[PDB]
Design a protein around this motif. Structure first.
Motif, short mmCIF file in Angstrom:
data_model
loop_
_atom_site.label_atom_id
_atom_site.label_comp_id
_atom_site.label_asym_id
_atom_site.label_seq_id
_atom_site.Cartn_x
_atom_site.Cartn_y
_atom_site.Cartn_z
N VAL A 1 0.97 0.80 -6.14
CA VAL A 1 0.97 1.73 -7.25
C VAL A 1 0.56 1.01 -8.53
O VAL A 1 -0.25 1.52 -9.30
CB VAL A 1 2.36 2.34 -7.40
N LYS A 2 1.13 -0.17 -8.76
CA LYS A 2 0.81 -0.95 -9.94
C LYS A 2 -0.66 -1.35 -9.93
O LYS A 2 -1.31 -1.36 -10.97
CB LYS A 2 1.70 -2.19 -9.98
N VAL A 3 -1.18 -1.66 -8.74
CA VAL A 3 -2.57 -2.05 -8.60
C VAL A 3 -3.46 -1.09 -9.37
O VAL A 3 -4.62 -1.40 -9.65
CB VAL A 3 -2.94 -2.06 -7.12
N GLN A 4 -2.91 0.07 -9.73
CA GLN A 4 -3.66 1.07 -10.48
C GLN A 4 -3.35 0.94 -11.96
O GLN A 4 -4.25 1.04 -12.80
CB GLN A 4 -3.29 2.46 -9.97
N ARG B 1 0.83 -1.18 0.00
CA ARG B 1 0.00 0.00 0.00
C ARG B 1 0.88 1.25 0.00
O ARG B 1 0.40 2.34 0.29
CB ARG B 1 -0.91 -0.02 1.22
N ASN B 2 2.16 1.08 -0.33
CA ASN B 2 3.09 2.18 -0.36
C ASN B 2 4.10 1.98 -1.49
O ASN B 2 5.12 2.65 -1.53
CB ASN B 2 3.80 2.30 0.98
N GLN B 3 3.80 1.05 -2.40
CA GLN B 3 4.67 0.76 -3.51
C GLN B 3 3.96 -0.14 -4.51
O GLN B 3 3.17 0.33 -5.32
CB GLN B 3 5.95 0.10 -3.00
N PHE B 4 4.25 -1.44 -4.45
CA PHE B 4 3.63 -2.40 -5.35
C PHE B 4 2.20 -1.98 -5.64
O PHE B 4 1.73 -2.12 -6.77
CB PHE B 4 3.67 -3.79 -4.71
#
Length: 32
Positions: free
Chosen positions: A27-30, A22-25
């Motif tokens: 980001v890709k979730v988007q 929820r503070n990196q990876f």
């Protein structure tokens, strides 16, 4: 606004491991 105590317990603790994403990876979730 949660029910106070309902979350935090596991909520605040959740970020104690989830944040990693929820503070990196996450980001890709988007992805666009």
């Amino acid at each position: 606004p949660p029910l106070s105590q309902e979350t935090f317990s596991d909520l605040w603790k959740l970020l104690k491991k989830w944040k990693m994403r929820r503070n990196q990876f996450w980001v890709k979730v988007q992805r666009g």
